[PDB]
């Protein structure tokens, strides 16, 4: 019974991911997000343990679910005649990182450092669990404004992580790497690092660097805001044109710009409260 376990609230958003409603779990008043995905729009399917056929997004969410709060938690799911319904946790109060950057403009590097670090830990967790998100962007990052904790959301473009080449992609093009633009080929980790460089530029400059294919492949990073030389170096390294020239996640988190990160609670008290 789906309509009896959850009280449904207003629409939160709709788009390529489906339609997402605010909700509350009746048993304990837990805030949830209720995501509807039409069966005809699901590209990749998977099988659970019991071999029940579910969208791959359900498989990936189950693989990353745990106590670690940096990724969205799938609480339950249901199958309907023409759709699947996913019950996801909902931070409250919350703002996504796209709206946050729109309202605040370019972020102080201390705050960008804290946010970027948490995103790296969340993406490391995905990869540790065998999951490639493929749509890292500010729109897909929720800020818990009380706790200062970030959550990676919308695994609808994701895939099982593999070490061979990917030749399909349905994430966000302005965060996709030049090898995808040029050759329709990418490898998972180095493509994720590219999207992280786009994200870090977005945080410290107030918008993404590239809008057009020619800029993505062009190899020039112009800084529209004052950014420290250390931060610029890390961004330009993540945005190396050759995938093998990009840093690993270890090299990103050992980068000099990344040291002395704020704790999440400190981040909320200094920058969010």
């Amino acid at each position: 019974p789906l309509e009896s376990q959850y009280q449904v609230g207003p629409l939160l958003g709709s788009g390529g991911f489906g339609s997402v409603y605010s909700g509350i779990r009746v048993s304990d008043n837990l805030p949830v997000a209720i995501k509807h995905v039409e069966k005809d729009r699901i590209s990749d399917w998977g099988e659970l343990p019991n071999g029940t056929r579910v969208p791959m997004e359900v498989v990936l969410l189950k693989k990353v679910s745990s106590g670690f709060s940096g990724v969205i938690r799938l609480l339950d799911w249901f199958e309907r005649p023409d759709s699947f319904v996913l019950i996801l946790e909902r931070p409250e109060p919350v703002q996504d990182l796209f709206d946050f950057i729109t309202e605040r403009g370019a972020l102080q590097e201390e705050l960008a450092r804290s946010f970027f670090w948490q995103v790296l830990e969340a993406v490391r967790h995905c990869h540790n669990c065998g999951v490639l998100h493929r749509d890292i962007k500010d729109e897909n990052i929720l800020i818990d404004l009380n706790r200062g904790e970030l959550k990676l959301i919308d695994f609808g473009s994701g895939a099982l992580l593999k070490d061979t080449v990917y030749t399909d992609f349905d994430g966000t093009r302005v965060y996709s790497p030049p090898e995808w633009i040029r050759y329709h080929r990418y490898h998972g980790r180095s493509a994720a690092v590219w999207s992280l460089g786009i994200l870090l530029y977005d945080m410290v400059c107030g918008d993404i660097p590239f809008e057009h294919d020619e800029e993505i492949i062009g190899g020039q990073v112009f800084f529209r805001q004052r950014v420290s030389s250390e931060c610029q170096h890390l961004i330009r390294w993540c945005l190396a044109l050759r995938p093998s020239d990009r840093p690993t996640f270890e090299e990103i988190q050992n980068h000099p710009w990344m040291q002395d990160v704020l704790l999440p609670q400190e981040t909320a008290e200094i920058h969010l409260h």
Partner: peptide
């Protein structure tokens, strides 16, 4: 200049 969201796909 115009900052905007970008849909997936």
């Amino acid at each position: 200049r115009k900052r905007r969201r970008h849909p997936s796909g």
